[PDB]
């Protein structure tokens, strides 16, 4: 199966505040594994999965220092962006970053990722070639030329082809699953009766529910709060004829798609 690492970093400046509040969240295979928050009393990277408590105090000390570097970089960058967009003092602003690497089932690098958003909106992003930058905004051209002139891409590319893959291999070895959905249909009388197909206790979150021999209200997939997810799909059905309708759950942990009904 394929694998991935990501770091999602956020910096928020507010009027009343003085220095930005900076948060960095690390993920392996889309699950949170470390976290740093500058609002903490003694700010540092803390483990967020039990399998990371294997890492010794030199690992945490270095990571914490990298984060303090990021803190400096997001604060300065925020200051510069304030100038680029002619925004004055007195507002709240956000700078965000996503980086990391996707590996194939063979553990080789599939793709590097490096993207930045300002005010929730794409600012600049490293293209898949890890050589050129995409930057839509006129204001964002200043940053693109700055980064083309300094050679920044080569250095982010070295990180993404090297450290990201290297250290992802190490995390995969150290943290050596999926939970299949359990389905059931519920009956609710109305005007006609409502049949709502539930899938519960599944991980990861990717799922699809349908009703049928042809292909409706649903909810977006949601966390149960325990690590598992929920979803339901429901349909309007005339009374007495409810054995004719069939739900189908599709999930990557299922040997084959579920097919069930009201009973």
């Amino acid at each position: 199966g394929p694998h991935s690492m990501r770091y999602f970093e956020t910096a928020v400046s507010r009027p009343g505040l003085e220095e930005p509040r900076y948060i960095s969240v690390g993920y392996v295979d889309n699950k949170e594994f470390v976290r740093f928050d500058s609002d903490a009393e003694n700010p540092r990277y803390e483990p967020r999965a039990p399998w990371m408590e294997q890492e010794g105090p030199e690992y945490w000390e270095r990571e914490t220092q990298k984060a303090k570097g990021q803190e400096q970089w997001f604060r300065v960058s925020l200051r510069n962006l304030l100038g680029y967009y002619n925004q004055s003092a007195g507002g709240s602003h956000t700078l965000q970053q996503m980086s990391g690497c996707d590996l194939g089932s063979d553990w080789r690098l599939l793709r590097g990722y490096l993207q930045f958003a300002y005010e929730g909106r794409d600012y600049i992003a490293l293209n898949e070639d890890l050589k050129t930058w995409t930057a839509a905004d006129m204001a964002a051209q200043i940053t693109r030329r700055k980064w083309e002139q300094s050679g920044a891409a080569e250095h982010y590319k070295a990180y993404l082809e090297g450290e990201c893959v290297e250290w992802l291999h190490r995390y995969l070895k150290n943290g050596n699953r999926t939970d299949s959905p359990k389905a059931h249909v519920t009956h609710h009388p109305r005007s006609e009766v409502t049949l709502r197909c539930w899938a519960l206790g599944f991980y990861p979150a990717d799922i699809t529910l349908t009703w049928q021999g042809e292909e409706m209200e649903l909810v977006e997939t949601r966390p149960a709060g325990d690590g598992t997810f929920q979803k339901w799909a429901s349909v309007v059905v005339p009374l007495g004829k409810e054995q004719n309708y069939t739900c189908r759950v599709y999930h990557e942990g299922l040997p084959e798609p579920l097919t069930l009904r009201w009973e």
């Binding site: 570097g69 960058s77 700078l95 970053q97 980086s99 600049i124 700055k146 982010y156 990180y159 290297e166």
Partner: peptide, 9 residues
């Protein structure tokens, strides 16, 4: 292994 950014925006 957290990244470390290069040139500022």
């Amino acid at each position: 292994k957290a990244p470390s950014n290069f040139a500022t925006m």
